Amino acid sequence: GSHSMRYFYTSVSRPGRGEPRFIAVGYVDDTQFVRFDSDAASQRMEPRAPWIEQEGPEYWDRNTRNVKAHSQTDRANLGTLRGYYNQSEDGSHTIQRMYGCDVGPDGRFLRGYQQDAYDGKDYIALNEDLRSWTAADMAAQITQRKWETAHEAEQWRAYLEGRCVEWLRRYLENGKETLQRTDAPKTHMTHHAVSDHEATLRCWALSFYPAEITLTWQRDGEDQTQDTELVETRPAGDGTFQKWASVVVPSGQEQRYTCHVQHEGLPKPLTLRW
């Protein structure tokens, strides 16, 4: 199908307890493959999936060098922002950044992203044309002006339309078994009675990959959202995911309710009934 590769950077300041901390992680789809941690002893980019381990020493050295320069900048960027926003040094603050690219089933560029957040709120983002930026407030306008003069957009464009796309394709090939599978959800339904008048139906999906999935309830074939609960999709720890949806129904009416499971590993959506 389609595929994506993202890097997620998190920088945090620790006033009164030390210098900032920078953590980077890299994903292909819902599978993590690298990490870097400025607090850790190794000070190298580390493998986090079997299929990246085969990359050679210059791969690891160049990735380490690149992420170390970002680590150093973003750790300094915390002091910059605290000055733009006139924040007291008493406060602990956060810079986040996501960037990466999607490709279609032909392996070719669809879309690329670069988005930054300061304390969980949008700061600056690269627009879809990869040539201009959207600043969120007057502080991020300072950064926008700096980046537009120095022409930093087209370096992002080159990376996002070239190197990102091309190594995503390499990783997709090297980790064929892991990354290009669809593990169909294994489903079942539980039932929990607390009293005589009311029972909870729970629809389960286990062992599925990719993470994208939809569970919906129906009564008599009609959609039903009243009295339903849906938990966050959650990792099993073995590369698959889990999810459930539940509904409270009056006793005796269980038979009318259907759970519906849509996942790209299922040729036809599943239908389950108590």
Partner 1 sequence: IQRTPKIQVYSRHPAENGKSNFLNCYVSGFHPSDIEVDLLKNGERIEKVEHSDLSFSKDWSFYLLYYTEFTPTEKDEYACRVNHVTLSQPKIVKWDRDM
Partner 2 sequence: YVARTNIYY
| Residue 256 per-residue DSSP state | G
Pick from 28, 81, 199, 205 the residue near partner 2 by CB under 8 A: 81
Q: How far apart are CA 130 and CA 58, in angstroms?
A: 29
Tokens of 85: 């926003």
Query: Does 4 interact with partner 2 (rule: CB under 8 A)?
Result: no
Rg of the chain over all Cα atoms, to the nearest angstrom: 23
Question: Does 80 engage in binding with partner 1 (CB under 8 A)?
Answer: no
* Per-position b or e across 162-200, b if 16+ CB within 10 A of its CB: eebbebbeebbebbeebbeeeebbebebeeeeeeeeebe
Cα pseudo-dihedral 126, 128, 132, 136, rounded to 10: -50
Residue 211 binding: pick among partner 2, partner 1, none (C-beta 5-8 Å cut-off by kind): none
Q: Does 121 bind partner 1 (CB under 8 A)?
A: yes
- State which H helix or E strand residue 226 sits in: none
Please choose, out of 128-136, 144-152, 196-204, 225-233, the segment that lies near partner 2 by the rule CB under 8 A: 144-152
Chain position carrying tokens 């039932």: 191
Does residue 38 interact with partner 2 by CB under 8 A?
A: no
Of 21, 70, 256, 260, the residue at the interface with partner 2 (CB under 8 A) is: 70
Q: Which of 4, 71, 77, 96 binds partner 1 (CB under 8 A)?
A: 96
The per-residue DSSP string of 92-139 comes to --EEEEEEEEEE-TTS-EEEEEEEEEETTEEEEEE-TTSS-EEESSHH
202 binds partner 1 (CB under 8 A): yes
Residue in 16, 18, 105, 120 binding partner 1, rule: CB under 8 A: 120
Among the listed ranges 29-37, 74-82, 129-137, 171-179, the one in contact with partner 1 (CB under 8 A) is 29-37
Of positions 198, 234, 269, 273, contacts partner 1 by CB under 8 A: 234
Site for partner 1, rule CB under 8 A: 8, 10, 12, 23, 25, 27, 32, 35, 37, 48, 92, 94, 96, 98, 117, 119-121, 190, 192, 202, 206, 231-232, 234-238, 242, 244
